[PDB]
């Protein structure tokens, strides 16, 4: 909600309270999304100041406050800053920002990341260019310097992040994307390669000294209709765990397909139908193994722009003999969202 | 403070900075409330949107930021989300919300939870239905569907929370309350029973497979006067620790009495007089032992609706030979509160 | 940004998103400021209510959210509340506040704590009276009860803080300051002494039962010019670590000199030139050792009051044979700040 707007500076303080619950049989250990209370709340700000007609400054921070922990020792579990960056937009020359932000490949994956509660399986956090990462410098151009409406691109420099954990670490890398949007249609191609840290390489699964990720996306967004499609691949980038051996590392290779179709009724109901499949190839010891494989049926009802509720049902297609131990049970999310 | 209110959506951003200090002899280890700096600050939001004339959506999140930690490793100690839920209110049909909220028995205990700094001893957190818990679905009706002014009730479903700690865990349960308020008078009855988790049962103290809690309250609230009274009981629900053996678990049984009398002078001074006693029965090994037992004399002065100060003095009646090791020294809290 | 102002109560919600990066050779282990992403964001509030013409209440809380952590286990690293206090200002009698705030000696050190990114080396946190500490009661008088324009003083009572760490602990103490400001000129003297805790005394380095710190400052602040100077000394107060032996404690004695000169161009550019040197004396085992020693060249450009960028370059004068192991490499900070 725009809580401030004077002297060319407007601040938007936003946030949401999400009452959420997951339903899965058993202890949800073998299910797709887990089982039980998953309530949480978000709080963040979006600032934008007009330094003059062509130059705009801006900044954004967003935090995740878990609402399913006790007030005891476990109180902070799951709490984190999602975004934190600042930047400048200049006329038609483009924009540049730095800090914790979305990797460029997400410019692709963003297409299908539209399910009510699940979806966007391949958009992992602190995983190179697919989701939110720290230390990214990002340049973005819109409409090819104003010369070609609908043609956009971005380049992104990822700075090395040596964390205590191989899963949350990364070496330096570069990534870019090109997308074109013409009247309800949109197409994108995104790609990024990077160095893997010593620790990442010291992991049991996966083998290489470079990490790659590219995805393409197609979408039809108009007339209350939303059909989007994604296909991407990766090398030594996708994090995987062998639940049996308790071994971890990255998939040597994965081929990812995400499909989504939705419709927005004028009365507030937005039904959703999706399909996701991500399969690892050449996993040391296992061979080819599905990481994600399901159908999704769900719906969101919007009371207005501030209130809504939804049910997200995952019809898991992963089978019980999945070599890595990926769960095979279904998961049903019900939630009630307030937001400003 | 209502920082936003447009298009039927109003957001209230609130918070307080509390300079606080406890005075107790010794290392406050044997005193009632501890000794030293207890400064803290709170920040939260309360949103409410009018979906139309009969339907209202809403949400609330509230966080506790300890202000007595260093900027070192201990910086996060005591930090937590107190509330986090969303819900809908429909005409005279009632309201329903879900997320982290107050257990139904607190509908009773809330009566005497009015001391300047202490009080509400029996309203523990993550303790079934007495204080704030996670995963509660709560339905509340006011004025019996609009048919009977002053008659209100609530039912509440508690979802199982299996935490690493027996103290912060719980099984599924149900609770409800009925209260009636007629011209300054108010009466309530609250009750809830629930399953105890494996771990809770694996504890040394307490013995059962179900946890119960009920409290009743009477109050006179009018003409600058506030006299409230509470009496409740519990079975295998109250958490207790034997400081000697370092053993823990829950009291098999407790009988709780809380008394409060206060007066609001027109010039801002609100003196307070209270009495609290909670006694455990059949504690394995000890027998009958007082958990809480004191008198309270204190005062709050309100400069205005945003500023105030207070002194809360606990005249501890617990004696030095208390079998569990509950402290016997007095505690005096002084604080200065700014709030918006 | 003043987001609220009604009925004599105004709240100012402020914050900033800082994209920041450090450049140092090697693993920045031997450099002055480290190497890599140092992005972060701040959020805090400042409230002030007019209880009447002479009496003002107020409160302030400020939090630091690190933006260079992953969304994993390390997510909370570096997060902390910087300030948290409440107080009252009465006519010309002065003000008094309590909670986490700035120690009185900082009334001196504040003079030179003006570098774009570095500087204020001696203003440590949770280090008695030099930086932010918890549990400080502070009385401040301005203009000597209104009788002498420009004459100000403060007294401060520090309450004992026994933390798990000797570095973050403190015993009771008292401190005061006197400063005088006449037309662009300002002079200050600050001093404080305190008890050292058992644990602090149990440390290998440093020897005493009392901790002292005093600093004086001179400054010329006018006509776009800023020249400030600080000289202070300490006894058993400055925390020091022997990187070789991995030993820690406090310097028996230190002599600190901080120098700063800056100029604000009308077009937004504020160049900066500074010099800092802090040298420990009588360090058990080493003798005299420099703790900090460098020159600083840097610049800040202000697009407007909400946006800016800067480069801070540290020309480290510490030499590679520094007995304690203090790093000798240079560090260059580049950052882009959005703030409201
Ligand atoms: C505003 C500071 C931007 C700093 C960018 C540093 C990029 C470092 O490595 C990039 C490798 O690709
Ligand atoms: C909006 C989601 C509500 C989910 C409620 C789940 C309740 C589960 O168990 C209740 C046992 O009593
Ligand atoms: C508003 C409460 C103020 C409490 C101040 C306590 C100071 C304790 O020790 C000071 C030692 O000097």
From Swiss-Prot, chains A, B, C:
Q: Which Pfam families match?
A: Porin_1 (PF00267)
Q: What is the effect of changing residue 117 to G?
A: In strain: B/r; AA sequence
Q: SUPFAM superfamilies this protein is in?
A: Porins (SSF56935)
Protein's GO biological process: monoatomic ion transmembrane transport; protein homotrimerization; protein transport
Residue stretches in coiled coil:
none
Q: Which UniProt keywords apply?
A: Cell outer membrane, Ion transport, Membrane, Porin, Protein transport, Signal, Transmembrane, Transmembrane beta strand, Transport
Q: What is its induction behaviour?
A: By growth in low osmolarity conditions (low sugar or salt); activated at low osmolarity by OmpR, repressed at high osmolarity by OmpR (at protein level). Levels of OmpF protein decrease in a lon/ycgE double disruption (at protein level).
Where is the major localization of this protein?
A: membrane
Q: Does the keyword Protein transport apply?
A: yes
Q: Which residues lie on this side of the membrane: Extracellular?
A: 24-38, 67-82, 101-134, 160-171, 196-210, 236-252, 282-291, 316-330
Q: Name one GO cellular component term.
A: membrane
Localization (cell): Cell outer membrane
Cite the CDD domains for this sequence: gram_neg_porins
- Keyword Transmembrane listed? The answer is yes
Q: Give the InterPro entries listed for this entry.
A: Gram-neg_bact_OMP (IPR050298), Gram_neg_porin_domain (IPR033900), Porin_dom_sf (IPR023614), Porin_gammaproteobac (IPR001897), Porin_Gram-ve (IPR001702), Porin_Gram-ve_CS (IPR013793)
Domain comment quoted from the record? Each subunit of the trimer has a water-filled pore with a narrow, elliptically shaped (7 X 11 Angstroms) selectivity filter which has a solvent accessible area of 30-40 Angstroms(2).
* Entry's family note: Belongs to the Gram-negative porin family.
How is this protein organized at the quaternary level? Homotrimer. Forms mixed heterotrimers with OmpC and with PhoE; other mixed heterotrimers are also probable.
Q: Quote the function comment for this protein.
A: Forms pores that allow passive diffusion of small molecules across the outer membrane. (Microbial infection) It is also a receptor for the bacteriophage T2. Is the major receptor for colicin E5.
What name goes with this protein? Outer membrane porin F
Say which species the protein is native to: Escherichia coli (strain K12)
Name the encoding gene, please. Answer: ompF
